[PDB]
Amino acid sequence: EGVKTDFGPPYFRDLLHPVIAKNYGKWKYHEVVKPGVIKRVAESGDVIYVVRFGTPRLLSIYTVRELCDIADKYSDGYLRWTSRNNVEFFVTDESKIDDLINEVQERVGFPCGGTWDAVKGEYGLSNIVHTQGWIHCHTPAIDASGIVKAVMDELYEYFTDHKLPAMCRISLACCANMCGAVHASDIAIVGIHRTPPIPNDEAIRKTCEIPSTVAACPTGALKPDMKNKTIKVDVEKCMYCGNCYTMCPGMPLFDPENDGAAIMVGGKLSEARRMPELSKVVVPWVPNEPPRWPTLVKYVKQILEAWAANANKHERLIEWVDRIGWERFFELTGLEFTQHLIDDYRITPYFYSEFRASTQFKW
Amino acid sequence: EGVKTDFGPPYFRDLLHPVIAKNYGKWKYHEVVKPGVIKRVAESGDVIYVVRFGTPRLLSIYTVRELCDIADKYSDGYLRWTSRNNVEFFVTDESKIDDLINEVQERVGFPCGGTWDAVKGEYGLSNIVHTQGWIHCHTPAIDASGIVKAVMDELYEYFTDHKLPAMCRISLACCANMCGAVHASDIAIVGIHRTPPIPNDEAIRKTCEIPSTVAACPTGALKPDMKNKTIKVDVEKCMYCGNCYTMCPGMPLFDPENDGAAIMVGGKLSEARRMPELSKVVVPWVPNEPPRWPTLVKYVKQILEAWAANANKHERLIEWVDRIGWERFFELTGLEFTQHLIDDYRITPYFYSEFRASTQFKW
Amino acid sequence: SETPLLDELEKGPWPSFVKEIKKTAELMEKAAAEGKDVKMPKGARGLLKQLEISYKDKKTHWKHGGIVSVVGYGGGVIGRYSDLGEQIPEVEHFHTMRINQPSGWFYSTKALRGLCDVWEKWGSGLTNFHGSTGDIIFLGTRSEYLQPCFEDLGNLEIPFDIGGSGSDLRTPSACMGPALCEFACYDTLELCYDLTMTYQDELHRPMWPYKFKIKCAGCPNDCVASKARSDFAIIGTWKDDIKVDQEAVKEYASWMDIENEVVKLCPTGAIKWDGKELTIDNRECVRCMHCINKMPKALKPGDERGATILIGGKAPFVEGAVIGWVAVPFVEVEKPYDEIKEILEAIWDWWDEEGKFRERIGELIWRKGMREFLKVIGREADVRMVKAPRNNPFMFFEKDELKPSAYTEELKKRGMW
Amino acid sequence: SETPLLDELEKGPWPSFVKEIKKTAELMEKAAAEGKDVKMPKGARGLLKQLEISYKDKKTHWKHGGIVSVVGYGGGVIGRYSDLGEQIPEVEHFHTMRINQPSGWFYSTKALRGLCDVWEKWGSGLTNFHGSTGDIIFLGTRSEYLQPCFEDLGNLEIPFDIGGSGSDLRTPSACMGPALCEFACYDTLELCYDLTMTYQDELHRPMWPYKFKIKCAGCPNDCVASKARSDFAIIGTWKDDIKVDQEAVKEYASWMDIENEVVKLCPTGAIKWDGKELTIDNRECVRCMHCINKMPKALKPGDERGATILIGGKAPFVEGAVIGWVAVPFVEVEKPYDEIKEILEAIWDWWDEEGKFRERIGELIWRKGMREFLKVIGREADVRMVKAPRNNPFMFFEKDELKPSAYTEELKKRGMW
Numbered sequence A, B: 001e002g003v004k005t006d007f008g009p010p011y012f013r014d015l016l017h018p019v020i021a022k023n024y025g026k027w028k029y030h031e032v033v034k035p036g037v038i039k040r041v042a043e044s045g046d047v048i049y050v051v052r053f054g055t056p057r058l059l060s061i062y063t064v065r066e067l068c069d070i071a072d073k074y075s076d077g078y079l080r081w082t083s084r085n086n087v088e089f090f091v092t093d094e095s096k097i098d099d100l101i102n103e104v105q106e107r108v109g110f111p112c113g114g115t116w117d118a119v120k121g122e123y124g125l126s127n128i129v130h131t132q133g134w135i136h137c138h139t140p141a142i143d144a145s146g147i148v149k150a151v152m153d154e155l156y157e158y159f160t161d162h163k164l165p166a167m168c169r170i171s172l173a174c175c176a177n178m179c180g181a182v183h184a185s186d187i188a189i190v191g192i193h194r195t196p197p198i199p200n201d202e203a204i205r206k207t208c209e210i211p212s213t214v215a216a217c218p219t220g221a222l223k224p225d226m227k228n229k230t231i232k233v234d235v236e237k238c239m240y241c242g243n244c245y246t247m248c249p250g251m252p253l254f255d256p257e258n259d260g261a262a263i264m265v266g267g268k269l270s271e272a273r274r275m276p277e278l279s280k281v282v283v284p285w286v287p288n289e290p291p292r293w294p295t296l297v298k299y300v301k302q303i304l305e306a307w308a309a310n311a312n313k314h315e316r317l318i319e320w321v322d323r324i325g326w327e328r329f330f331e332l333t334g335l336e337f338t339q340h341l342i343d344d345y346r347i348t349p350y351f352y353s354e355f356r357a358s359t360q361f362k363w
Numbered sequence C, D: 001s002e003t004p005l006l007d008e009l010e011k012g013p014w015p016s017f018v019k020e021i022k023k024t025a026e027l028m029e030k031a032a033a034e035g036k037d038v039k040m041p042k043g044a045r046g047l048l049k050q051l052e053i054s055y056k057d058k059k060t061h062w063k064h065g066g067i068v069s070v071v072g073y074g075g076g077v078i079g080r081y082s083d084l085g086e087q088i089p090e091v092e093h094f095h096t097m098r099i100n101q102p103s104g105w106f107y108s109t110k111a112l113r114g115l116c117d118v119w120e121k122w123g124s125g126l127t128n129f130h131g132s133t134g135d136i137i138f139l140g141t142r143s144e145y146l147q148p149c150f151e152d153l154g155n156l157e158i159p160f161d162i163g164g165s166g167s168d169l170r171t172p173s174a175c176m177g178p179a180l181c182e183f184a185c186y187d188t189l190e191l192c193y194d195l196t197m198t199y200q201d202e203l204h205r206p207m208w209p210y211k212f213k214i215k216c217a218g219c220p221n222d223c224v225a226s227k228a229r230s231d232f233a234i235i236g237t238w239k240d241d242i243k244v245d246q247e248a249v250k251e252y253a254s255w256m257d258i259e260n261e262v263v264k265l266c267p268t269g270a271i272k273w274d275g276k277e278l279t280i281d282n283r284e285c286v287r288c289m290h291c292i293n294k295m296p297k298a299l300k301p302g303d304e305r306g307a308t309i310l311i312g313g314k315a316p317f318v319e320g321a322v323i324g325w326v327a328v329p330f331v332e333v334e335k336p337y338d339e340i341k342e343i344l345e346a347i348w349d350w351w352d353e354e355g356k357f358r359e360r361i362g363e364l365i366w367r368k369g370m371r372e373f374l375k376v377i378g379r380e381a382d383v384r385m386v387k388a389p390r391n392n393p394f395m396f397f398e399k400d401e402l403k404p405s406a407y408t409e410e411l412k413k414r415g416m417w
């Protein structure tokens, strides 16, 4: 026989609740009943309630098993995750929804919420997309899981209720690689370095393919040193992006006192009302201060609260800035503008600003 | 004693009309009476009329002498030119305005107009800013004067009346050095080449400084040839900009059959209603067809008329595009979008698009 | 406490990842103590110890890892090695296995219980539901367990294959689409599955200059963020009229400020409401979704459905982050999706031929130009691909576009044509 | 039929440049036949003949010309050589002289006539009124006549000096400003003259990496197009309230659709008209001028006046075409303009030291960054300098901004600091 390979993921259709399989592609409408609970009504007359809960993303297999027991009890053995790592159950008996919610809260401590209702125009804050941080990655500038927890503790009330006037995605990149749509989030927390690498010549000779490491530097701060079969850094050209360390173990640049997070704002993925946008730096640096990152958290909250106090219904952060301008943004958020915030990333072509980075166009 | 140097231009204040000189910086309001004539009212209550006339820019000294004869008669021996190379007379007797207009047309053949009235919202087409072409320049791809002549004969009635619903600047450059405000005009005509340079090895050895010529190519299509002491050109990288010829007489790229003009659209300099804008190519190439350039002229007129027929009052070309989109612009102007119009000029930094290229900001 | 910093993060209302790690450590240790077949019962506790140290030092303790894989594949598993591996040997090698999710993250409990049983046996017990691309992450195992874990995965009643990593086709992902969403313009789940199966070889055996990611969103709300984090974003759209139920609009109007919340928020002013009849000028509509999002009982996407393809989306390195741009304004999405496959295979053949080491497709297009890219996919330039035509006259022209001339003849004679 | 192609261009209502050239030859040759002191009578006809051949060939007949100047100066004269020099001897040499215009192109008839007399004596008789930078163009003379022509210009009752060319300070130009315009926020014409006078050496004797242009606009309408055609654009502005005459607003309101033509066109919604009172939220106003342009009898710029400085404007070569961007949000404009001169001279010292051969200031700033540029001029970064903060996290930090650390000590230890 030999080991089976190239068989791919189990086919999803087989893993759908029968009521979902039955009504697949034949939905009439959805209705957000209350935070965390969405009613979906099929053309057949079937009604199913999709009940959503926040999760820490990192799950114990034992928590997955508990979710399975809950799904067997309330959703006929079916569930899904969402694209922001919330978890959802499918309930056909409306009188059981609150029983499910209470059971999830009791058994795994996951809050019902993370929904929003465009129809009434009241929005929850959903989960923070994030990645590995110090839990698993060799290139982070900041932790991911710790910051997400510290932030969601402070903003918890916004997850469990529809208290915001528009969508607000908070997302976290533990380094400049992003590993997520962090560069297009309403509020993005992005791990940065502020110190150049110090080449380890022995490590570079042993392990680094020089031409490709040199070609990895967006500023051309690296040059080969043929004499010493290594690489030299022009520290005046380096902005500490860390890409050369991705390529080369001999180029580390981590400094625990100077690594930290930039806070960016005003990104957008959806098309609704306004084109998608890359996020923009408004706080150059906050230190890592584990376990609660109070400086970072204070700024995220300061930004979210200023936006929420002032935004109209549906007006996302970038849309609020579209309205008031950056001068007012910095005033109302209490943030200082400094020269760091003036873009100087030379290599990106202006012509990209002329491409249609959006599905919005007329036929 | 020798020769006097470093004395500068004559002091402007000494060359001012008494009414202008008297009421300097003490004006109440202007009023556009009719096309070509602008009433200016001082706080002192003094009234003067500035009367504007189209020139072919290139003037015979005998035309200037005649202008001086006209100026002595009607404007106290005073006149000015405008930043679009029109000429203006200063009349204090309103009954004598019409006479001056007739005598300018009879003597020098200059039309009255080139004005606009934002108050009522009726706009004339003013003069076309342009350069030297085959008259005096060694790097042109098109003539200037010939085309400007052809275009303005065709568009004449827009100069002498207020037939347009917003401001429209037409401008011309004979080569990509794009002398003038061509890169920020509502409609711009730019001379382009479509053939790469054929290096002249002898002329390069005698007359060119190789490293500075090589360094002037925006695409890096140029390289020193060592064992021939000359320049090599990689045709695949060349987009026929002609900068290398500017540097080096040994680098001509003129092909009478393939030189011609690109037509660009939607630049804006003023702040009013919306930020300044750089012009955009909408017609990649039209032939030189001296002396009337009928292909070029048809497209300029085609573009202008389509805009005029659809634009709201004050809605300049770029603003019209803001409203309808480029999809509808190409349909309405009857133009073809081709790959040529997708920007691929690599060297320009994206960060420029984030700089405030405008005086519009809040205090 | 052994973990005084991390213990701070068990406090507070949001569910604690610290609690998940400690629950795993506690119950893996218990399972092993009970005689269950558990290969790495100390893995989760090691991870906890490493993390506490990282909290105190404010830095990672992970280093570059070796290259590790399951037999027959070259992607899907990433070696990770701890620099604390002498002090905490249970995390010295702590690799991840990316496990291809079912389309839209739909599971039965039977499927998930199989995965739990396999990872309890071979790995730390920690998982991510889900990795950012969409895969399930099995977080932490040793090199010697990768192959046996994979054999068990393949032998489950509901088996699971490895997803992508490295310079390959990554695991495609899809929004819930028509399983639940009345907005879906094509079958996101079916397409995602069919692409995954079609290109198993490209996914499992990296052969390309760099990574390539595909994501499938059912409509322009883009609920999988395909345009920021896939190179090839397949985003549902329609070509005909928005469907309007007038009785339902009137019902909305009894309570909803349609003027301020819908009409004034339309990006192109396509949709109007006079108190009696809702009108949409679909020629003006850019299909942004907002009105349909506002009035889902009254408004629907049109009947002539397909997708727009956005190309290039990527994180920053090297030449800057990209929200992908219009490459294909409209393609039909009907099984077996030959049109989509044809485009993908053309792009891949070209990118493999022309691409530099670690050059993303978006960067290759920036380097070679849209003209070359479009010829590769056998499509014509379209105005919808740009937000604006170029702001400079520095255009390249094709040889066959030029007038015959003495110069063009000279160029031929000189050998430069 | 000497000039059949050019002849067609004497037809039509727009005043003909061919008629301008034909008149010049015909009167210059008349003068030299009448015994008037005229050195190049065949100047204009030769030009006409060349242009006719040019029209036939559809190409220029001018080539690269020698470096030719007046004594004591290095710029202001552009050498031009014809390649039909043997067939048409009269245009073998055909150099331009750029003559500095008075500020705002204001002339007395006496001043102009002096120019005519001198050029009739020494050149072709062809001029441009005006060359794009602002200068009067004397179009076509021989090398021998440059120095005597200039001598005569500086000997005139109202004397004219040479303007700029080459890698120098170009001739500054200015909008009419306070001479005629009620929108003027400063004395553009005085500023322009004072600058021209103060930097005579820098204009006359090119010593810089490349050219540098200054233009002076009295308010944001930018009527000399300073932001596109100057490296240093001085654009008038104000800091206080737009002055509002409610009486005059009602006069407009009686015939003007203020709602649609003013209120709805304000870029920031700052201006309100309810039918009785006009209100301007000056905090929201971006001083775009539209409302003031619209109701000039009613609306005036504020009394706290100065200028905004936009830096970097230029044509495309080499790095792309530039509309200048905010360098100094507000500077006072008062004689002797020490604050402005301080800025300019710091910019020049820096540019001269740091600029590459043929690098424009805009390209230098792009290369070196705004931090270095602002330090050079002694000003702080301001949010008003950008349309948006950067879209990526790749920030440089000053050494002294860093927290002292074992890492920074290591950098210092290695001399990498």
Ligand code: SRM
Residues within 6 Å of the ligand: A030, A032, A038, A081, A082, A083, A084, A085, A086, A114, A115, A116, A117, A118, A119, A126, A127, A129, A167, A169, A181, A184, A185, A186, A267, A268, A269, A270, A271, A272, A314, C104, C174, C175, C176, C177, C180, C181, C182, C183, C221, C222, C223, C224, C225, C293, C294, C296
């Ligand atoms: C379940 C999920 C899809 C999935 O396959 O998992 C989903 C499901 C829905 N999305 Fe979404 N979206 C999901 C991620 C997203 C994301 C992707 C992301 O954040 O990474 C976005 C793009 C975010 C962005 O724009 O930056 C997204 C932007 C939207 C939009 C736009 C809102 C806006 O005003 O811009 C709508 C419209 C709306 O508000 O009803 C939307 C609307 C919906 C609707 C109402 C569609 C429908 O007809 O049912 C679904 C219920 C959402 C709700 O709570 O009201 N969905 N949706 C996603 C849940 C994430 C979570 O747990 O919170």
Ligand code: SRM
Residues within 6 Å of the ligand: A130, A131, A132, A136, A137, A138, A139, A177, A178, A179, A180, A181, A246, C078, C079, C080, C096, C098, C128, C130, C131, C132, C133, C134, C135, C136, C137, C163, C164, C170, C171, C211, C213, C228, C229, C230, C313, C314, C315, C316, C317, C318, C360
């Ligand atoms: C596991 C995952 C994060 C997570 O915790 O969920 C991940 C983790 C890593 N990413 Fe990623 N990326 C993950 C999705 C992404 C995404 C989002 C996506 O796929 O939807 C992106 C943005 C899109 C893109 O690829 O550009 C992303 C952009 C990167 C980058 C930058 C790419 C660029 O051109 O800038 C790197 C660096 C590189 O490619 O060398 C990278 C490299 C890495 C490395 C291999 C670290 C490195 O510096 O070499 C990560 C290993 C962590 C570890 O060993 O545990 N990862 N990475 C995500 C994949 C799991 C899965 O299969 O579901």
Ligand code: SRM
Residues within 6 Å of the ligand: B030, B032, B038, B052, B081, B082, B083, B084, B085, B086, B114, B115, B116, B117, B118, B126, B127, B167, B169, B181, B184, B185, B186, B267, B268, B269, B270, B271, B272, D104, D174, D175, D176, D177, D180, D181, D182, D183, D221, D222, D223, D224, D225, D293, D296
């Ligand atoms: C005469 C001249 C000044 C000078 O010679 O020093 C001038 C004079 C005035 N301009 Fe201008 N502008 C002059 C060049 C310009 C040009 C600059 C250029 O084309 O190189 C434009 C900028 C072009 C652009 O925006 O791309 C210009 C931008 C304006 C704006 C246009 C507002 C808009 O709709 O965008 C105002 C506002 C207005 O319409 O009243 C304006 C208005 C004015 C006013 C009304 C100011 C006033 O209070 O009197 C002056 C009368 C013009 C008129 O006909 O209504 N002037 N003005 C200019 C010579 C041009 C000509 O002969 O036609």
Ligand code: SRM
Residues within 6 Å of the ligand: B130, B131, B132, B136, B137, B138, B139, B177, B178, B179, B180, B181, B246, D078, D079, D080, D096, D098, D128, D130, D131, D132, D133, D134, D135, D136, D137, D163, D164, D211, D213, D228, D229, D230, D313, D314, D315, D316, D317, D318, D360
């Ligand atoms: C004299 C003038 C003719 C005209 O009517 O346009 C002129 C004509 C020439 N320009 Fe210019 N420029 C003239 C104003 C401009 C302007 C507009 C302005 O100054 O207001 C620009 C755009 C602003 C700028 O400088 O960027 C302009 C941008 C250029 C270019 C492009 C520089 C760049 O960075 O891209 C070259 C510079 C070069 O060749 O090195 C140039 C160079 C030249 C040369 C010397 C040709 C060359 O490539 O060597 C010109 C000689 C023509 C001749 O011999 O008859 N000229 N040129 C213009 C000014 C007359 C005057 O003194 O008043």
Ligand code: SF4
Residues within 6 Å of the ligand: A131, A132, A133, A137, A138, A139, A140, A141, A173, A174, A175, A176, A177, A178, A179
């Ligand atoms: S964003 Fe950076 S630190 Fe976080 S997982 Fe990706 S590569 Fe690692």
Ligand code: SF4
Residues within 6 Å of the ligand: A196, A197, A216, A217, A218, A219, A220, A221, A222, A233, A237, A238, A239, A240, A241, A242, A243, A244, A245, A251, A253
């Ligand atoms: S950290 Fe980034 S900028 Fe600095 S040398 Fe490495 S790759 Fe280059």
Ligand code: SF4
Residues within 6 Å of the ligand: B131, B132, B133, B137, B138, B139, B140, B141, B173, B174, B175, B176, B177, B178, B179
């Ligand atoms: S635009 Fe070009 S061809 Fe025209 S005058 Fe300037 S340098 Fe010469």
Ligand code: SF4
Residues within 6 Å of the ligand: B196, B197, B216, B217, B218, B219, B220, B221, B222, B233, B237, B238, B239, B240, B241, B242, B243, B244, B245, B253
């Ligand atoms: S014409 Fe332009 S692109 Fe071509 S070699 Fe010369 S300078 Fe380079």
Ligand code: SF4
Residues within 6 Å of the ligand: C175, C176, C177, C178, C181, C182, C183, C184, C185, C217, C218, C219, C220, C221, C222, C223, C224
């Ligand atoms: S992208 Fe569209 S089809 Fe898919 S879940 Fe979101 S709203 Fe529904």
Ligand code: SF4
Residues within 6 Å of the ligand: A273, C265, C266, C267, C268, C269, C270, C271, C280, C284, C285, C286, C287, C288, C289, C290, C291, C292
């Ligand atoms: S989908 Fe968007 S663009 Fe179309 S009518 Fe609705 S709100 Fe307007």
Ligand code: SF4
Residues within 6 Å of the ligand: D175, D176, D177, D178, D181, D182, D183, D184, D185, D217, D218, D219, D220, D221, D222, D223, D224
């Ligand atoms: S720039 Fe302003 S001050 Fe100068 S003429 Fe134009 S409107 Fe008047």
Ligand code: SF4
Residues within 6 Å of the ligand: B273, D265, D266, D267, D268, D269, D270, D271, D280, D284, D285, D286, D287, D288, D289, D290, D291, D292
């Ligand atoms: S100047 Fe412009 S921004 Fe200010 S109130 Fe008037 S129209 Fe509005």
Ligand SMILES: O=S([O-])[O-]
Residues within 6 Å of the ligand: A179, C133, C165, C166, C211
């Ligand atoms: O693992 S990352 O490259 O998607």
Ligand SMILES: O=S([O-])[O-]
Residues within 6 Å of the ligand: B179, D133, D165, D166, D211
């Ligand atoms: O002559 S150009 O440099 O203005």
